Design a protein around this nucleic acid. Sequence first.
RNA 1: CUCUAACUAUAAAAAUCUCUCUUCUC
Lengths: 64, 78, 150, 129, 102, 206
Amino acid sequence: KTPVTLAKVIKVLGRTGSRGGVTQVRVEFLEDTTRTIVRNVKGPVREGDILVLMESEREARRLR
Amino acid sequence: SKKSHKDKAKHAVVLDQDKFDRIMKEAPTYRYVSVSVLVDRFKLGGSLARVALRHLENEGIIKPVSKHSKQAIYTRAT
Amino acid sequence: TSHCRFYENKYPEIDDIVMVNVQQIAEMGAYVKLLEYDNIEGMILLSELSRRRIRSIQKLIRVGKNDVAVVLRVDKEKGYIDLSKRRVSSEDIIKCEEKYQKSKTVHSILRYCAEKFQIPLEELYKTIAWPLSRKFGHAYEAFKLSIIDE
Amino acid sequence: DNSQVFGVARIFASFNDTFVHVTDLSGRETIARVTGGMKVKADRDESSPYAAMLAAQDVAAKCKEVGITAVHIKIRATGGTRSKTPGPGGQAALRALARSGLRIGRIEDVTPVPSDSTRKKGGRRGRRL
Amino acid sequence: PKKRASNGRNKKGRGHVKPVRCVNCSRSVPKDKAIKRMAIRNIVEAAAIRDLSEASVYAEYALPKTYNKLHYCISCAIHARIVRVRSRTDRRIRAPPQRPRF
Amino acid sequence: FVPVELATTIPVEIQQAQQEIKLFNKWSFEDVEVKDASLVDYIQISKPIYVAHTAGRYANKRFRKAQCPIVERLTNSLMMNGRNNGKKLKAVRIVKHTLEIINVLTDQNPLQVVVDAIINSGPREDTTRVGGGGAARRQAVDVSPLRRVNQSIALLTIGAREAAFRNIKTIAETLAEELINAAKGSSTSYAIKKKDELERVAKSNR
RNA sequence: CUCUAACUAUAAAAAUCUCUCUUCUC
Ligand SMILES: [Mg+2]
Ligand SMILES: [Mg+2]
Ligand SMILES: [Mg+2]
Ligand SMILES: [Zn+2]
């Protein structure tokens, strides 16, 4: 199965994690633009990028 | 230290008539042959590998495209 | 050539119990060979490594030995083994030990021929393994019955 | 009705090993008892949302196989003596049930609550972790 | 010394109060000095209200809520961030901290 | 086509009709593209370049790195374990020889082969050590586009290193072969192998 | 000079410690 999903971040939700390197991002999926989901991403990010997700069901909370 | 290498001779540095024929036969059908690509097939030690390579560039069996030191690019001619 | 897996097929089944041999540890866990199934590497993750908390790692894995564990998921397409050490029953550990010893005895038995007659070990074991393991149980009982009545 | 096959999800969400256990309207005939621990390996992320989500997806597949389409969820916590508080997994299980095709109706809070019964566990000074 | 005039208890005229057990640490504590929070919550968060909505017969459901009255201890409450150690002159202000959401 | 008269004439292959700027006068920045839509804007093949070495001030701000040509980034990351540190000249010739090799075996404009290897080699979901003290366990996270690109390129060059060390095989050929193996979903590539391992350690530890 | 709404979620382990204490009026 190849259910790869794509999502464009619309707002950067600061940076979470004890390491201080992981970003919470509010991404709206390119397909079904009406829906938005917040997820964690490791690595530099800026709004307007489009990111890749293996799973889209998982909602990401703060990483403690 | 330990006898873990277990590396054999793995190379014949100077060709015989048999390996001469194998080189001149398998010279085509290979899109790319280098010094170490030639070494890979176990048929030459490697110092004479480039000797054999330049000696296949005598009647244009293999055309050269880049002639830099330590790395020359040879492609079979057609 | 120590090869030609003990059981019917090369690729391990699902949720199956094994004993494994350790060779190296990179940073996450250890992808280490198996001497219960075919020698394809099986990888253990540190989350599934130690019943006690992770503070020393070189004493619980003891690289270069035999350790009881159970394989969770198997990749039979090109060969990846997901292998787990914790969720093993205290009574099934004895099962793993005895089964590993039985397979070790089978390996020891069917190596003498391959080295005395220099024929392929894989061919001879493939010929022998059809009545050997699948009849109704392990080979050792069959071998003992054969020596007392072939 | 629109020729629907109603069911009840009745999630039980403790602080460990979220439960998803669908049954009929009579409540007696059980369907898809698969729980959170069924679908996670650690035996300790059982309360995590992932376990509940995979359990809910497998329940949804079983329900589609058996025909039950719309559901009547009964969210439950351990309650009673223990903390009266919903677990984290059960909500994610409910969301996963919502996503995968099935329909909902009349979600209920069925937390068992006592009227000060059961002199309960902990002692005077209580937990001393 | 007298840390608080009200003794930090809020009994002041009852003699004895019925103890209640903490939600987390299970410590018995006088019901008045048993810091209490009305956890009134919607049964699902906004990240799933949609998901449930389009997967719902009976359009525009009431979406029933869950209510609870958490009777913490004081040790759990100070540890689990419910109550905060404030300054001396700020102790005497008993109003809730200025409209949590405005 | 338009030969120009000069008191000093640059040869034909450099002079004739090169208003079609080429990397090494043999491979076109046209006819090459990014197969995956996600990584675009971070594999900068837009600006034509004649030499994969420029005095770029590509680290002053946070995201001037993505403006560097991808080939130049591969050059600069090729020379790690910098006993060779500096020496970008030899890195440029190593990568140029690698491009020639890729042109020889399954040509497919090696620029596209590099792009395809980058696309297939960058991990998409990774893990992080945020477990606090007691239950020291690793948790899943998504991978940023630039982080994906850097991991792909550095993993490719370190694989070229692992192939090249104390080996008769020359590093140009080693890195080239890694790019063939990474252009397709071949498991023999070290970079693709590490990518798959990291993807699985993310998948299992959600 | 008329106004009564929105919410999240951690408690792994961590013991012990030698001298030597003294000076302000113009
Ligand atoms: Mg404490
Ligand atoms: Mg005091
Ligand atoms: Mg009080
Ligand atoms: Zn408490």
